[PDB]
Amino acid sequence: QTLPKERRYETLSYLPPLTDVQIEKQVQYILSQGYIPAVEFNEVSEPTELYWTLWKLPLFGAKTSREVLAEVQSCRSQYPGHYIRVVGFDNIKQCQILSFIVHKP
């Protein structure tokens, strides 16, 4: 048996396609470390192309609640043909704590 030529995308791509319960349980790691999470959309996932466009904000309303999870489904209804992400942000270390695709075209 072999390995197929399959294009893979980001830091959780070598998995089954992430359902909604998992992403609710995924962002609950992001915002529980004091981090501000976000949603980033893009047309293609290119190695050259290293910015993806931020969706409305790095949204945040409280210490821990459903913030991102409702906003992704609003972006699935807005952009059903863009690579949607969920990214974290740290401000002390000043890099992203996650970057993974929740939705593909």
């Binding site: 072999t2 294009r7 070598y14 998995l15 995924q26 790691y29 293609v44 190695p47 974290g88 992203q96």
Partner: protein, 434 residues
């Protein structure tokens, strides 16, 4: 002597402290050997002022559980050493003092470069943060094969084993220690047939794949023409065996990679001559701090899985020294001096033991996000080749990254997430047994 043993000397915030592990010859008392390791690393045994440039031992602290051994904390001043020269730290401190004959063994355990002296260096070319920003790889420890067999592969067959590993989710791929150039495989052709195999595997799967091209070379001219060629193949990363090639060639390539945007993978070849015996040599947390001050975005910190609690607290001691901004003095965890790095960029800590699939719970729990996990060093590959062998080493990563990011204690619930990821991956299920 005993003018170099000032036990009341509170050391300044600009001294360059050093904690030896002196094992003196018998009959030599502890203060007089600790004044001696402060002697012949300065102001050897008036024409100047002695009291301004002398190394001063300021504390003894006998090692618990073992007589004839102590930890001579020496306090070298700032203006003894060169701005920006980590080969003048070692020429001053471990230069003329280990072969001192009143000592049976002398081990430089730790060293505190002050904030005043860290700022003369460059640090890494790119930190943890800027390395992840260049590679666009966030929130996971990165990966690597090591191309087996080492010797004998021609440069295209070598790049086919690189392209095969770099398809299946692997981030990096290491070039070997004993591969710089050799009559079967020259570097100009090894770098060419690896750039043709990165841009095939980077264009196939859209991640920024890289390869630690070995720019360790006989001369510093031949090193920089070996790195300027990996710049002109647009390679993201080179590597360099920094203890065989030294700290003058490393700091040359530090300054080069910062001025050319190439990541630098520092490999700790010939490290075990000097950090492996527990009584004599230079502990690697000196040599870890010594290349965080010179270049390197990655350094091999070996492995954790084959070591005890005390032998991995010391290994997680110098992983924190090269990766965290401020590290508190904790001697059970190995660190002797509190070390402010003064916002110097971090270095990745690379895990490269005899490790495989079943160690992804362990090395994502121990080594955090800010790490690289090599493979293929001791473990015997994979039955289906390299691209199912690398997808086994990548699905087992992101299962253990997903598990850690859901509260699942990988210390206890770690072997469950390997077994429940071997179901959804046929490449990992055949790697699940060996």
């Amino acid at each position: 002597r005993l003018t170099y043993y000032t036990p009341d000397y509170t050391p300044k915030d600009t001294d360059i402290l050093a904690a030896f592990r002196v094992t003196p010859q018998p009959g030599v008392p502890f203060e007089e050997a600790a004044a001696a390791v402060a002697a012949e690393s300065s102001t050897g045994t008036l024409l100047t002022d002695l009291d301004r440039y002398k190394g001063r031992c300021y504390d003894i602290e006998p090692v618990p559980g073992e007589d004839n051994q102590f930890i001579a904390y020496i306090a070298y001043p700032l203006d003894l050493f060169e701005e920006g020269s980590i080969t003048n730290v070692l020429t001053s401190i471990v230069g003329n003092v280990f072969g001192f004959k009143a000592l049976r063994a002398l081990r430089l355990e730790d060293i505190r470069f002050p904030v005043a002296y860290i700022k003369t260096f460059q640090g890494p070319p790119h930190g943890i943060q800027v390395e992840r920003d260049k590679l666009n790889k966030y929130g996971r420890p990165l990966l690597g094969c090591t191309i087996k067999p080492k010797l004998g592969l021609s440069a295209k067959n070598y790049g086919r084993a690189v392209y095969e590993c770099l398809r299946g989710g692997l981030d990096f791929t290491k070039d070997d220690e004993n591969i710089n150039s050799a009559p079967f495989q020259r570097w100009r052709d090894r770098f060419l047939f690896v750039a043709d195999a990165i841009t095939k595997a980077q264009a196939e799967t859209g991640e920024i794949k890289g390869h630690y091209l070995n720019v360790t070379a006989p001369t510093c001219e031949e090193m920089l023409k070996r790195a300027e060629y990996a710049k002109e193949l647009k390679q993201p990363i080179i590597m360099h065996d920094y203890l065989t090639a030294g700290f003058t060639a490393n700091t040359t390539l530090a300054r080069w990679c910062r001025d050319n945007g190439v990541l630098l993978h520092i490999h700790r070849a010939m490290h075990a001559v000097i950090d492996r015996q527990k009584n004599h040599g230079i502990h690697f947390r000196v040599l870890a701090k010594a290349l965080r001050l010179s270049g390197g975005d990655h350094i091999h910190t070996g492995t954790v899985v084959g070591k005890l609690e005390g032998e991995r607290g010391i290994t997680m001691g110098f992983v924190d020294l090269l990766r965290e901004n401020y590290v508190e003095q904790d001697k059970s965890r190995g660190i002797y001096f509190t070390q402010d790095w003064a916002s110097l960029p971090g270095v990745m800590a690379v895990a490269s033991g005899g490790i495989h699939v079943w160690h992804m719970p362990a090395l994502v729990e121990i080594f955090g996000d800010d790490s690289v996990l090599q493979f293929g060093g001791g473990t015997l590959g994979h039955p289906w080749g390299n691209a199912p062998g690398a997808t086994a080493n990548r699905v087992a990563l992101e299962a253990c990254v997903q598990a850690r990011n859901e509260g699942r204690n990988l210390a206890r619930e770690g072997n469950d997430v390997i077994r429940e990821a071997a179901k959804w991956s046929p490449e990992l299920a055949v790697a699940c047994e060996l």
